[PDB]
Amino acid sequence: MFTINAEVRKEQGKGASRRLRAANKFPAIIYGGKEAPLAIELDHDKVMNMQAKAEFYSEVLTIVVDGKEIKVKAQDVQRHPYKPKLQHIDFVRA
Amino acid sequence: YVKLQVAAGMANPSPPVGPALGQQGVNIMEFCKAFNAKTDSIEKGLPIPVVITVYADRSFTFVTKTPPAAVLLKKAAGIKSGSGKPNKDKVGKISRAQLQEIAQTKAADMTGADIEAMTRSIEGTARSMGLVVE
Amino acid sequence: MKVRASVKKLCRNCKIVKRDGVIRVICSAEPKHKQRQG
Amino acid sequence: MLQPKRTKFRKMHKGRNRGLAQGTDVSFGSFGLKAVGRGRLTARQIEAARRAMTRAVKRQGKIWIRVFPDKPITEKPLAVRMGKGKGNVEYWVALIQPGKVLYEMDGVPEELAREAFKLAAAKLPIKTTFVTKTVM
Amino acid sequence: ALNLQDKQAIVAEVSEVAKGALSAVVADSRGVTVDKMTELRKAGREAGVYMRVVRNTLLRRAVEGTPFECLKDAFVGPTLIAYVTEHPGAAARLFKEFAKANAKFEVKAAAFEGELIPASQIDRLATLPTYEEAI
RNA sequence: AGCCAGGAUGUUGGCUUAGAAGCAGCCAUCAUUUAAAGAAAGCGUAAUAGCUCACUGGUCGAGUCGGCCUGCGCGGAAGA
Ligand SMILES: [Mg+2]
Ligand SMILES: [Mg+2]
Ligand SMILES: [Mg+2]
Ligand SMILES: [Zn+2]
Numbered sequence: 325m326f327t328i329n330a331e332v333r334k335e336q337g338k339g340a341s342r343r344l345r346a347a348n349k350f351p352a353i354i355y356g357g358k359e360a361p362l363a364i365e366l367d368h369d370k371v372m373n374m375q376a377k378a379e380f381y382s383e384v385l386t387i388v389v390d391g392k393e394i395k396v397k398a399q400d401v402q403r404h405p406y407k408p409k410l411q412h413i414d415f416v417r418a
Numbered sequence: 419y420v421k422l423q424v425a426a427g428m429a430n431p432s433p434p435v436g437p438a439l440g441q442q443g444v445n446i447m448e449f450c451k452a453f454n455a456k457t458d459s460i461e462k463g464l465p466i467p468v469v470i471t472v473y474a475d476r477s478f479t480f481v482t483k484t485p486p487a488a489v490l491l492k493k494a495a496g497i498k499s500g501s502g503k504p505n506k507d508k509v510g511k512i513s514r515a516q517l518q519e520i521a522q523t524k525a526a527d528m529t530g531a532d533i534e535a536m537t538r539s540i541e542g543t544a545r546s547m548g549l550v551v552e
Numbered sequence: 553m554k555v556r557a558s559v560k561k562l563c564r565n566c567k568i569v570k571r572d573g574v575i576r577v578i579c580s581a582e583p584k585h586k587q588r589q590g
Numbered sequence: 591m592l593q594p595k596r597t598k599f600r601k602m603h604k605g606r607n608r609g610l611a612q613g614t615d616v617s618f619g620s621f622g623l624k625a626v627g628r629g630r631l632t633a634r635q636i637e638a639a640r641r642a643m644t645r646a647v648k649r650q651g652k653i654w655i656r657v658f659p660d661k662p663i664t665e666k667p668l669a670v671r672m673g674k675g676k677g678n679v680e681y682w683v684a685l686i687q688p689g690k691v692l693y694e695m696d697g698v699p700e701e702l703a704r705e706a707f708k709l710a711a712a713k714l715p716i717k718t719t720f721v722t723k724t725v726m
Numbered sequence: 727a728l729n730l731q732d733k734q735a736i737v738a739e740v741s742e743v744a745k746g747a748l749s750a751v752v753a754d755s756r757g758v759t760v761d762k763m764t765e766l767r768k769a770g771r772e773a774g775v776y777m778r779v780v781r782n783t784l785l786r787r788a789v790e791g792t793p794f795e796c797l798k799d800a801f802v803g804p805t806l807i808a809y810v811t812e813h814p815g816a817a818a819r820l821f822k823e824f825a826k827a828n829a830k831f832e833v834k835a836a837a838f839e840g841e842l843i844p845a846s847q848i849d850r851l852a853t854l855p856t857y858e859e860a861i
Numbered sequence: 862a863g864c865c866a867g868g869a870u871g872u873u874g875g876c877u878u879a880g881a882a883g884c885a886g887c888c889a890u891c892a893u894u895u896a897a898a899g900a901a902a903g904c905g906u907a908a909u910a911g912c913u914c915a916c917u918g919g920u921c922g923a924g925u926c927g928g929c930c931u932g933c934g935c936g937g938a939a940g941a
Binding site for chain 2: 869870871872873874875876879882887888889891892893894908909910
């Protein structure tokens with residue numbers, strides 16, 4: 325059972341998102357259902373390792389944000405053009 | 419110390435035996451008819467492997483062994499030559515029984531703890547030479 | 553001695569060694585395998 | 591050797607080669623050879639590399655070529671001055687941007703695909719890297 | 727090499743054999759070709775004796791289960807165990823003439839009675855008759 | 862990692878060949894006894910023999926192996 329630690333993003337747009345990745349973090353988004361989308365930021369190495377196991381893309385994951393647990397599934401993923409890296413992830417509330 | 423596979427009641431020839439152990443210091447005629455003398459009891463036309471054992475004074479002893487698996491399998495399949503392409507071209511059939519017989523002879527010569535094991539080895543040969551077990 | 557830009561182990565008895573700032577292949581088995589980067 | 595069978599026009603502006611690649615995932619095979627650098631691949635290069643990887647697997651499995659050299663390149667020969675009309679078309683290139691999967695492959699063990707793609711990459715004028723299929 | 731699941735299974739089996747047997751003879755067997763081993767195997771199967779080379783670490787685990795814990799110290803150096811599961815002795819016998827004859831390896835300590843048996847004095851087991859001698 | 866020892870049986874596998882025995886080439890690559898030992902990784906022979914590797918028991922006693930993201934360097938580097 326995957327557990328991902330996230331903080332809500334304080335900024336948005338291109339500048340903020342590139343600064344995240346220069347800092348070994350990367351943006352992501354949680355949408356679905358009744359609640360509003362929740363823009364977040366993730367630790368790159370931690371999620372990189374996780375998603376190298378097929379289970380990630382097919383299991384109910386739990387994102388922890390301010391000590392709250394959100395149950396999600398991976399929905400889309402943007403990868404770097406040619407490095408073993410993640411640019412962004414969509415999670416849909418499960 | 420040399421190892422050959424010689425025809426039962428036959429020995430002496432130059433390209434076959436002569437030169438081979440002849441160039442080690444071995445008395446040809448002696449071994450020829452001693453070999454034949456003891457291999458008289460073998461069935462006709464069974465190629466039998468002999469281990470020749472020579473000592474510094476050119477004198478020698480030897481042990482006779484059971485014929486090769488390939489040989490017995492050739493004879494059991496009623497054929498003359500193994501497949502040129504084993505398991506791509508099949509060239510015949512030995513029953514499980516024939517396997518077992520050959521296995522008991524070669525059992526006198528195997529290292530199998532059981533009939534089944536020996537038989538499996540003989541099967542291994544039979545496979546190796548494109549003979550099917552039928 | 554083979555002298556070239558790309559030096560490698562050519563067999564299991566080849567060793568890469570650096571001597572005096574220069575990369576080399578030394579072999580204990582085949583003299584032809586001996587190289588110097590250059 | 592790849593070439594468009596026919597085209598609307600014979601000749602093409604030089605143009606530029608900015609941007610990241612489209613078609614960055616392994617979409618047909620199991621493994622892929624991906625461009626890490628920017629540049630032009632000629633039809634002869636693409637061919638040389640296709641041969642190499644295909645020797646390497648002993649024509650087993652299956653191979654896909656994701657790029658196609660559809661850009662005509664012209665040249666002026668020796669001892670001709672500038673102007674007097676655009677040069678003659680001599681060969682064809684594909685424009686390559688970082689991230690393009692160049693070749694794909696499957697039906698072979700990964701170890702053999704890496705070797706084959708290693709041999710092929712030595713024929714190409716742009717750095718490349720080895721990639722794999724991914725769920726999503 | 728040998729995964730942990732392997733070695734656990736190797737122990738279990740050697741231990742189960744140890745429960746059924748009645749006389750264990752331990753020897754060095756280093757420096758003997760496989761043909762003379764293969765020969766000793768036909769002599770073990772013939773005489774109903776179970777033969778194994780096993781890691782000294784791994785044997786210590788089998789032993790402890792009972793009643794061979796005296797043999798621990800016999801597991802320094804290359805080790806060959808001999809389990810006479812049907813009848814007692816005959817292995818102790820067999821190993822020594824085989825030991826003497828081949829002037830390679832040595833023989834360490836045997837064990838019967840839950841008592842370690844000292845290299846020299848093993849001559850006890852190596853002279854115990856047949857079962858099948860009391861008649 | 863180093864060092865000791867083993868690396869066996871059918872069997873010289875089948876075909877081919879003057880010979881082809883793990884080791885020119887072609888096909889097969891099973892099975893046995895195994896702690897382990899490929900119908901053989903390389904040298905070797907006219908063919909054997911002979912050396913060695915894979916693999917395994919022993920000794921030693923706490924680390925060891927090599928892919929990933931990255932910083933700075935090294936070779937590649939010859940001219941009047
Ligand atoms: Mg900007
Ligand atoms: Mg110097
Ligand atoms: Mg070691
Ligand atoms: Zn070398």
